[PDB]
């Protein structure tokens, strides 16, 4: 049949396979969604496509991409905006009921080069196994680590500590809850020190960064940290809190029903046994869900992220995935229709439910089964409305590596120096200059 390859990160492939099958049934055999399964690695996945694009691989069809590099891919013409889809519908479809921030984020020079499909932000994901309430301030997070470490308790708190985009994103969130930003809203000028107050916020964040680099009873091995290990620290009870994406909830509920969550051994429960199906995947009745959900509420609470100042709501950095038809695509109009069907409300339902992660249709906020499927959705909605966002910038990829390079030297974190150093680096990045480290 007429295959459409859904090129995506491999991490959720089972969801994509089952929904693609449901879509292939719905397509009446006209054309077939097929999973092309990118590296777990972000960058790798993102840059492996650049190879296949540059060669114009004729098998390249529908590409998932992270919101950030879209400006570059649009400028290079690697995908076509939703106005150009010969089905005509695609622009209106991406306009219809899509939440505002993601829709704006796809609008490169106001043109939607691609359609939003999923989104994420990091929670103040707090275990109630020890702490009475989450610290709503990042200094409060140092205080709870200190207290728990003085108690000899579950003192760690889990964060994206390794040298890849996760550290940069965390920094961007810290910076913008401190009101700071990396470049102007046009991208036309560095803004980390374009006010001395931006400089102050930058070195204030640098002081925060150096302090969390050494906080009492933190994760002793945070140097290379990622969500895999970060969840592992909380669910083992080594940490009491996780700074992590909404995937923390379903993956924790699965592991509780594996019995691995130290304070939540839901593997003991005959309704939750077998809810982990033949492929080990939690698949509950309304009863099995409510049982596990109530038992989780008894020992955990999601919350908005710790503010950069006392009682300041954190402008958490927004994230998400957009789908785009690559300009290689032979079946380009059919691919536009396939994009439309993955945008359909039952797909949005399935991806929020079986897929466990935030869909982008606003109308699902009004669904009790979505409110059940994502109890945090309203915190998500508020934090999304409050969110920081990375600057729409074709050079973003390179800029972010240039920023990352400065962070690398963890041992010496001279706020005043490193802020000027990275300022030079991002100037050189905007200049496009030099053989890249």
């Amino acid at each position: 049949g007429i295959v459409i390859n859904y090129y995506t990160p491999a991490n959720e492939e089972a969801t994509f396979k089952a929904v693609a099958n449901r879509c292939n049934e719905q397509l009446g055999g006209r054309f077939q969604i097929a999973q092309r399964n990118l590296p777990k690695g972000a960058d790798d996945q993102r840059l492996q496509l650049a190879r296949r694009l540059t060669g114009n691989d004729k098998s390249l069809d529908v590409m998932a991409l992270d919101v950030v590099w879209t400006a570059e891919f649009a400028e290079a013409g690697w995908a076509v905006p939703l106005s150009e889809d010969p089905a005509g519908l695609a622009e209106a479809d991406a306009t219809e009921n899509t939440l505002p921030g993601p829709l704006e984020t796809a609008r490169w020079q106001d043109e939607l080069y691609a359609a939003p499909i999923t989104t994420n932000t990091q929670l103040l994901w707090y275990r109630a196994d020890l702490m009475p309430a989450p610290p709503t301030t990042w200094d409060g997070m140092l205080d709870e680590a200190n207290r728990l470490y003085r108690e000899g308790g579950p003192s760690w708190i889990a964060v994206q500590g390794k040298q890849y985009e996760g550290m940069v994103v965390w920094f961007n969130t810290l910076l913008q809850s401190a009101g700071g930003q990396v470049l102007s809203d046009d991208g036309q000028r560095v803004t980390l020190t374009d006010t001395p107050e931006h400089r102050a916020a930058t070195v204030k964040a640098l002081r925060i960064i150096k302090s969390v680099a050494t906080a009492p009873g933190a994760d002793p091995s945070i140097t290379q940290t990622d969500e895999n290990t970060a969840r592992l620290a909380l669910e083992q009870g080594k940490a009491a809190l996780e700074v992590n994406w909404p995937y923390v909830l379903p993956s924790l509920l699965e592991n509780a029903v594996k019995g691995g969550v130290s304070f939540l051994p839901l593997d003991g429960d005959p309704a939750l046994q077998g809810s982990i199906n033949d492929v080990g995947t939690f698949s509950p009745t309304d009863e099995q869900f409510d049982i596990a959900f109530d038992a989780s509420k008894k020992v955990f609470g999601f919350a908005p992220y710790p503010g950069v100042n006392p009682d300041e709501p954190a402008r958490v950095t927004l994230g998400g995935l957009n789908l785009a038809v690559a300009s290689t695509s032979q079946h380009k109009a059919e691919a536009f229709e396939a994009i439309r069907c993955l945008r359909n409300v039952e797909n949005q339902r399935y991806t929020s439910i079986e897929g466990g992660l935030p869909a982008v249709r606003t109308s699902l906020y009004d669904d009790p089964a979505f409110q059940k499927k994502y109890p945090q959705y309203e915190i998500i909605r508020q934090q999304l409305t409050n969110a920081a966002v990375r600057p729409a910038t074709p050079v973003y990829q390179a800029v972010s590596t240039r920023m990352s390079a400065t962070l690398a030297p963890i041992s010496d974190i001279d706020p005043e120096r490193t802020a000027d150093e990275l300022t030079e680096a991002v100037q050189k990045a905007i200049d496009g200059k030099g053989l890249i480290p």
Binding site: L47, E72, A76, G77, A398, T401, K433, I436
Partner: protein, 282 residues
């Protein structure tokens, strides 16, 4: 004469054309690409002329340091490699019993897919898991922290190349007459002094070409770094720097220029071994 001469030209022509075509156009297209300053992300944005484009790279401390670490890696590797290479070739030659099975033992690690060995050397040095790593104290993890990992790079890779050096060096021990060694050992030189004074000059040409190959093949290395670190700990070699341009920068001008500078950099050391030391093929 002319009958055979024209025949030989026609006989050699296919390979000569093949090797020419698969080299000349590539080097040409590279040189054309350098100063034709351009990016795959900027598909119509070609500079029609880019003077001193290569001088940007030549001026970059990040290039110059990347250049330097490649040499530091190679020459150390080559040195210990040579010392082991002759030690192996000597044993492999002078065996009391097992020369066949030892030949098998020599070839197996040479014949390996190089990525497999690279992964072997990558795990043995991961903390907790590594059968070598666990013998260190805590906080070590020698894959990390730049310079300690380069020791593992050298170790890993010379273990991979050494039998090939031994094979090539055995050509010296093979040509030398055993009675010439008996005549020498039937004189006034203690065994080490006798063996060195007699064998070394006979070993000279094989030694020269072994160093010539081992130098270049180490210099144009990639696998045993990339398949053991991302170049991330400033472990980036010349080669990984070369690759990252086509991997991420997409400035074909830069990628060319480093490729060209790499070609000059081998061209000089080849010219030294060839002309200054007098090396030539069998």
């Amino acid at each position: 004469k002319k009958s055979e001469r024209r025949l030989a030209f026609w006989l050699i022509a296919p390979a000569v054309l093949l090797m020419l075509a698969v080299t000349a156009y590539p080097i040409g297209y590279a040189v054309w690409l350098s100063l034709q300053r351009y990016n795959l992300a900027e598909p119509h944005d070609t500079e029609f002329i880019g003077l001193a484009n290569y001088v940007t790279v030549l001026t970059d401390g990040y290039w110059w340091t990347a250049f330097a670490v490649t040499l530091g890696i190679t020459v150390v590797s080559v040195a210990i490699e040579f010392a082991l290479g002759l030690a192996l070739a000597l044993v492999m030659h002078r065996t009391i019993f097992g020369k066949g099975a030892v030949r098998t033992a020599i070839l197996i690690p040479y014949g390996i897919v190089t990525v497999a060995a690279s992964y072997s050397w990558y795990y043995a040095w991961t903390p907790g898991t590594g059968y070598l790593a666990n013998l260190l104290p805590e906080g070590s993890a020698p894959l990390t922290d730049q310079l300690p990992s380069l020791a593992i790079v050298v170790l890993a890779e010379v273990w991979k190349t050494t039998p090939f050096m031994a094979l090539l060096l055995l050509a010296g021990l093979a040509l030398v007459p055993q009675d010439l060694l008996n005549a020498a050992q039937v004189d006034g030189a203690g065994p080490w002094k006798r063996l060195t004074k007699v064998i070394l000059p006979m070993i000279k040409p094989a030694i020269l070409v072994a160093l010539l190959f081992r130098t270049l093949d180490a210099f144009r290395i990639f696998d045993n770094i990339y398949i053991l670190t991302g170049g991330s700990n400033d472990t980036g070699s010349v080669s990984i720097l070369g690759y990252d341009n086509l991997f991420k920068a997409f400035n074909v001008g830069l990628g060319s220029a480093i490729s060209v500078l790499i070609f000059l950099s081998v061209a000089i050391i080849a010219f030294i071994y060839i002309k200054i030391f007098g090396a030539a093929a069998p």
